[PDB]
Each structure stands twice: as structure tokens, then as C-alpha cells.
């Protein structure tokens, strides 16, 4: 979904276009001409809001570059099957109907007056004859991402925007499961995303294997589809393609053969179905936090696979040529027990933080050894070994197997950048299980963080002993005004438990409009509610009172949708019934592993001498100005003197304090920051005589 949406993006900035600062705020708003061309919901939440949209589902680009939309023209009040595409001006000069407007099976407008859209943001009832054009589907004004949010018509605009944006950050799990409740866009989005291999021509499968599949076409020609497996994606996630066909099966042309990441039987599946109980629970789910059952962790329900990637190169130098070798200067054999003869880690060898990943030696010039270092070299027979150590090592906070190694050598006639001879890249794969700090979110724009992972024995359990897999706070639902999540929960429970609408006496009143095939469902069935045209509230109210009983012969949820839970700790039933139902939960990519950051003392910059360093050794935080006003307001003065001089900029104070802490003595007095000496030395270079002075007026030395 993320790739499909990116290919479908509509940038409004960049070369040849507006810039953030220069552009006014009037261009970021919606216009009545965006209906059907540019989705008004989907948009980045950051500062780039309104400058980046997405093509509507049915929008098409005319040769001149203007976005067209479909319409079926009404000739004399009768809807015509044939459709025409109208641009902005043509739409303005005509009259456009509304898809939801009731229409008789013969195409006669039952309502003499029908809601209409006019030139610019004007909507008014018009006779059923003056109307000139009609839409195609109610989902014409939504993007692809927003078209797969069930009950979108009930959520607020901002909440829908957040949910649509978050649907593009889901992390493909190990075992994807199709949603119980979801619109009809899932399958088409999955098919057109290009991540599922689809048979080009109808045929019969001869033999199918995890690596590859061979299909015999009806014309006597055989074709083989190679499925990439455990291939690193562009953002660290893994891409897998597991076949979903069996030997001796005749596959029709265009049928999905294997499912890529986030796909279950050829339909998008970004997350799993979890049993949700909406209630506050001892404050662990307080203010958007989430409580998860340990069953998810121990069942690999939300287990994700991530593949890192490291690479080093041996570039020739004026002083010599760097070469990768197993031997490394002055290192114990135990550390180098995993490297092979070629000097690289063996495939499948677990690698921890700080471990050596590939050993290389770089040429050395001339540098007289320090007295004791030279003596130690002499004593032990360890020659100077001038060549230094620059072996690539696993950065801080990485672990896992070494799935694959790729090496390009100039000797083998391979294309390398000028000045390089040996380039090797090692892929490290890590399997991540959901833990505290990882972000979860549904399709309705309700984020959260795992506050706690309770044991399966502590979670509240239904009357039949089925512990709930997740608990969501109830104080965040009505305030944020995304009531669609509760309706999704109710429909999900109805779909999971299955329902059988009573029909011996006849179809009830509330079920008059239900499709004839939708009056009976099996347990764990699949249901869909297309955006802006789906199950009304009456339908859910009727369904909730007709759910099938469990295998034990009892019905858990009442007509209202609530159930009587049992406390996991106290053991006594809760005083009042609680809402329960299956809700579709995704796993966002804002994992806690990447966010954790710490730095006691590392490398420093060059011009400014401030703390700095690539995220391998981690960099210090940013003590801005507001963080300084907060300190001043406290009356705190020594902390502010420290945070800006002794641990930030002092070239000698930093060393002195590090020695003092590593020694028993006290912390010395801070000196003058280098950011002020630099300022003076630069202000002097402008031919401005800047000299600090005492009360006596005597110039001072710094």
C-alpha cells in the first residue's frame, strides 16, 4: 500500500513549483473542484499539509495534463449506462448529481428534487429533469488508501486523515491475516500494487516449490515464476512471496499465484485481528496507552522480521592498498572465531553489538610508538604491525543472524567506483517481537503505545474463558470523535461469531435491504462495508441480536454488544458489562528499538567542537533556548552553567571532568565556552576591535 500510494502521489512543491516559505496558507486548503480528482482526506500531517495529495480512485489524467473524472450522463431523467469524462471547466458548466440519490430500477429518479453540485461549492435541490450528470460510485472522492477504512463515513476528517496516513506505515508481519471487516478495495489494491505475482496466461501448475513455480500454458509452453524470498525492502522490512497454489491445479489467467508482504490469499492484510475490550484497566492504558496480552508475544501474532545492511570497501591509497584479511593486528582468537579464511563472518553466525563483521587492514605511514607501547611490542615479540585496524563492526544496537553476504571484486571484472577494488556488504536479519514502546494503531486513526504486556492469566476473560488480547481506553473514543471504531468492533464480532437471521416468519423489517446472501453467515466469515455505502446502524443492531452461540451453547455478547467479563486478578466479575469485539490492529514502524538513544561521551565535531557523531555512536541531545528559559525560571544557575560549558563546548573542561568522574576528586570549575572564543576570534576578523575589560578598563586576555 505504501508503494502504491507513493507512485500515486501528487506533489505540489519542488523544482519549478512553490516553496514552503514563499507559498501562502490559502493554497493548502481544499477547493470545491477537488471532488473526484484529489483526495481531500489523505495528506501528510507534518508541515507539508495540503501540498501533497493523491489521485482519487477513478481520476485519470487527460493528455493536456488536467485531471478528469467519470460521469454517467442523464439524457431525459433516465440514467444512461455509458459514461463520459469531464474536466474542471466542463464540470463547472454542467450539472452534477449525487450517487447516493435514490434511483428506480428503470432509471427514474424517485425523488423529484435531488441533491446537486453546482459551479463552485454550491449545493441545492433541483428538479429531477434539469440534472445533467451523475456520479459513478460514492467512493469517487477518496484516495486508494482512504478507500479501505471501514465506516469512514462516521469518523471525523482529521481522524480519517491520521488513519489513512498510518495505514502506509504498517510493518509486514510473519503471518499476515486478512481483515474480518474491510472494504472491497483490499483485493484490487493488493493486485495492482505489484507485490503479488499473478499468472500471465491460464494454465495448469506442474510443480510448485517455495523457491519457484512452473506453470504449463494451454498452448504447450511452460513458464517459471521466480519468487524473491527474504529480500530487504527499501526501508529495512523484509519482502517474502509464499505460493498459495497446489500441484495439479488449473489457474485461470490473472489469478494470484503467490502473496507478497502484507497479503493473505491475494488481498491486502496489514495486520491481525485482536479481541478488543474497551474499558480503563488500572491506569496501564491511561491516555492512549495500550495493554496487550502476552499471548500475542508468545504466539508470534505480531512478530516482525527486519533486515539490516552493512558494507565496507577496500579503496586504494597513495600509501598502499587496503586488503580484507582474516588476520587482524593484536586481537584475541576468541573474538575472531566466527570469521572465515576470506576474512568475513560465516553465514548463519549470530552477531552481537560491537562484534567484528569483516576484517580489513589499512596501510600505515610512520608513527613512532609511545615508550611503553613500543616496550610492550618488544617484550611480547609483537612487531609494530604498522597496518591499522579499520574492520567494519556491527553498529550499536544491532543483532541477529547473517543471512547473506555479497562481495564484488575488481579482479572478477565487476563495476566498482573509481579507486575501489573490493566491496563487500553483509546483511543482518533480526526478528522483532512486540514489546513495550512499539506503536500499534487501528484503521480509524487511534494510535497507541504498549504500556504493559500482562500475562495471559491476568487479562480479563469472557464468560467462556477466552482472555481478551487487547484493552483500549474509553475516554479517548468520544472526545476524539471517531465513533467508527466501535461500529467496526461490533461488525467484527458479528462476522467472527457468525449470525443467522431468523426467517421462518419472514425477513424482519430491519433486514429488508440486506442482500439475500447476507442473511446467513458461518463463524469466522468475511464481511465488507464499502466506504459511504455500507451497513447502516439498524443492520448492526439487527445482526448483534442474531449471532450464533458458541460450541458450549451460550451467547457471550448481549443485544447491546456488551459482555460480562471476569477480572483476571481479583477473580470476581466486573459490576457492569463491557464492550467486546474483534478489531483490526496494525503494527506501525515507529518501533522502540530505533528510538532509544543514549550518549555519555563520544566523538566531537571539528569546527564547533560540540558533541557529534553518526548514529552508530549516537549524538547528544539539543538543549535549545526554551530549554534554557525553563532552567532560568527555576532560579537554577549552576545546571545551566554546566549544560552549556563543561559538557558541551569546553575543550579542556570536558577532559578534566571526565578524568574527575573516573577519579575520586571533585568536578572542576567550568571555563569559557569555545563557542564564545570562536565568536570573538571571528568578530575580530571583521576589523572590529572586540576586547573584554574589567572595571578599571584594562584589556583582558582570553
Amino acid at each position: 500500500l505504501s508503494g502504491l500510494t507513493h507512485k500515486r502521489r501528487l506533489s505540489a512543491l519542488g523544482p519549478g513549483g512553490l516553496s514552503r516559505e514563499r507559498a501562502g496558507l490559502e493554497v493548502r486548503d481544499v477547493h470545491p473542484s477537488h471532488y473526484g480528482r484529489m483526495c481531500p482526506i489523505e495528506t501528510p500531517e507534518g508541515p507539508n499539509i495540503g501540498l501533497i495529495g493523491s489521485l482519487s480512485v477513478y481520476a485519470r489524467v487527460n493528455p493536456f495534463g488536467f485531471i478528469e473524472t467519470p460521469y454517467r450522463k442523464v439524457v431525459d431523467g433516465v440514467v444512461s449506462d455509458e459514461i463520459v469524462y469531464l474536466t474542471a471547466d466542463e464540470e463547472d458548466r454542467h450539472v452534477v448529481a449525487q450517487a447516493n440519490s435514490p434511483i428506480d430500477a428503470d432509471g427514474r429518479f424517485v425523488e423529484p428534487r435531488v441533491l446537486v453540485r453546482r459551479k463552485a461549492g454550491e449545493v441545492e435541490y433541483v428538479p429531477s429533469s434539469e440534472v445533467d450528470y451523475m456520479d459513478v460510485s460514492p467512493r469517487q472522492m477518496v484516495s486508494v488508501a482512504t478507500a479501505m477504512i471501514p465506516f469512514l463515513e462516521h469518523d471525523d476528517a482529521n481522524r480519517a486523515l491520521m488513519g489513512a496516513n498510518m495505514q502506509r506505515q504498517a510493518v509486514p508481519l510473519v503471518r499476515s491475516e486478512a481483515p474480518l471487516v474491510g472494504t472491497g478495495m483490499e483485493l484490487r489494491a493488493a493486485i495492482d500494487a505489484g507485490d503479488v505475482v499473478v499468472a500471465e496466461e491460464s494454465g495448469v501448475i506442474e510443480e510448485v516449490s517455495a523457491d519457484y513455480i512452473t506453470v504449463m500454458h494451454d498452448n504447450g509452453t511452460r513458464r517459471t515464476y521466480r519468487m524473491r524470498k527474504f529480500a530487504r525492502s527499501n526501508h529495512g522490512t523484509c519482502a517474502n512471496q509464499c505460493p498459495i497454489v497446489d500441484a495439479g491445479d488449473r489457474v485461470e489467467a490473472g489469478q494470484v499465484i503467490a502473496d507478497g508482504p502484507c497479503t493473505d490469499d491475494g488481498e491486502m492484510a496489514l495486520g491481525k485481528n485482536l479481541l478488543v475490550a474497551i474499558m480503563p484497566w488500572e491506569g496501564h492504558n491511561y491516555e492512549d496507552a495500550i495493554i496487550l496480552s502476552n499471548r500475542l508475544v508468545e504466539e508470534d501474532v505480531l512478530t516482525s522480521i527486519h533486515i539490516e545492511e552493512h558494507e565496507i570497501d577496500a579503496r586504494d591509497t597513495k600509501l598502499g592498498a587496503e586488503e580484507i584479511t582474516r588476520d587482524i593486528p593484536n586481537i584475541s582468537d576468541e573474538v575472531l572465531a566466527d570469521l572465515d579464511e576470506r576474512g568475513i563472518v560465516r553465514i548463519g553466525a549470530e552477531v552481537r553489538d560491537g562484534d567484528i563483521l569483516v576484517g580489513k587492514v589499512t596501510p600505515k605511514g610512520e608513527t613512532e610508538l609511545t615508550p611503553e607501547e613500543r616496550l610492550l611490542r618488544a617484550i611480547f615479540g609483537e612487531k609494530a604491525r604498522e597496518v591499522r585496524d579499520t574492520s567494519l563492526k556491527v553498529p550499536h544496537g544491532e543483532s541477529g543472524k547473517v543471512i547473506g553476504i555479497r562481495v564484488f571484486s575488481r579482479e572478477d571484472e565487476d563495476e566498482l567506483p573509481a579507486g575501489v577494488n573490493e566491496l563487500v556488504r553483509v546483511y543482518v536479519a533480526q526478528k522483532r517481537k512486540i514489546s513495550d514502546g512499539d506503536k500499534l494503531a487501528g484503521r480509524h486513526g487511534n494510535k497507541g503505545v504498549i504500556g504493559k504486556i500482562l500475562p495471559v492469566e491476568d487479562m480479563p476473560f469472557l464468560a467462556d474463558g477466552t482472555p481478551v488480547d487487547i484493552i483500549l481506553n474509553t475516554h479517548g473514543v468520544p472526545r476524539r470523535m471517531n465513533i467508527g471504531q466501535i461500529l467496526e468492533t461490533h461488525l467484527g464480532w458479528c462476522a467472527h461469531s457468525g449470525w443467522k437471521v431468523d426467517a421462518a416468519k419472514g425477513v424482519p423489517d430491519w433486514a429488508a435491504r440486506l442482500p439475500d446472501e447476507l442473511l446467513e453467515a458461518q463463524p469466522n466469515a468475511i464481511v465488507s462495508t464499502p466506504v459511504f455505502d455500507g451497513a447502516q446502524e439498524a443492520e448492526l443492531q439487527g445482526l448483534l441480536s442474531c449471532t450464533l452461540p458458541n460450541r458450549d451453547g451460550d451467547v457471550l455478547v448481549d443485544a447491546d454488544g456488551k459482555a460480562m467479563l471476569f477480572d483476571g486478578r481479583s477473580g470476581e466479575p466486573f459490576p457492569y458489562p463491557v464492550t467486546v469485539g474483534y478489531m483490526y490492529i496494525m503494527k506501525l514502524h515507529h518501533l522502540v528499538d530505533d528510538k532509544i538513544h543514549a550518549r555519555s561521551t563520544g566523538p566531537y565535531s571539528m569546527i564547533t567542537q560540540q558533541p557529534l557523531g553518526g548514529k552508530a555512536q549516537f549524538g547528544g541531545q539539543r538543549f535549545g533556548e526554551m530549554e534554557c528559559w525553563a532552567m532560568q525560571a527555576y532560579g537554577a544557575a549552576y545546571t545551566l552553567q554546566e549544560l552549556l560549558t563543561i559538557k558541551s563546548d569546553d575543550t579542556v573542561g570536558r577532559v578534566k571532568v571526565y578524568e574527575a568522574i573516573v577519579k575520586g576528586e571533585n568536578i572542576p570549575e567550568p571555563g569559557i565556552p569555545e563557542s564564545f572564543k570562536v565568536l570573538l576570534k571571528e568578530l575580530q576578523s571583521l576589523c572590529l576591535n572586540v576586547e573584554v575589560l574589567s572595571s578599571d578598563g584594562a584589556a583582558i586576555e582570553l
Binding site: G184, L187, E517, A525, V527, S528, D533
Partner: peptide, 25 residues
């Protein structure tokens, strides 16, 4: 009305029929 041959069967609460299928996304 699954356009693709081997789609999973998921009934829908659809009260209207779309005259045009979604074009190539």
C-alpha cells in the same frame, strides 16, 4: 462480481451497483 478469477468470497453490505470498475490504479 469478483473481477479476478480466484478472489476470496466476502459478501458486502452493498446497496448500489457501480457501473464502472476501478481503473488500473
Amino acid at each position: 462480481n469478483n473481477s479476478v478469477p480466484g478472489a476470496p468470497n466476502r459478501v458486502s453490505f452493498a446497496k448500489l451497483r457501480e457501473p464502472l470498475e476501478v481503473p488500473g490504479l
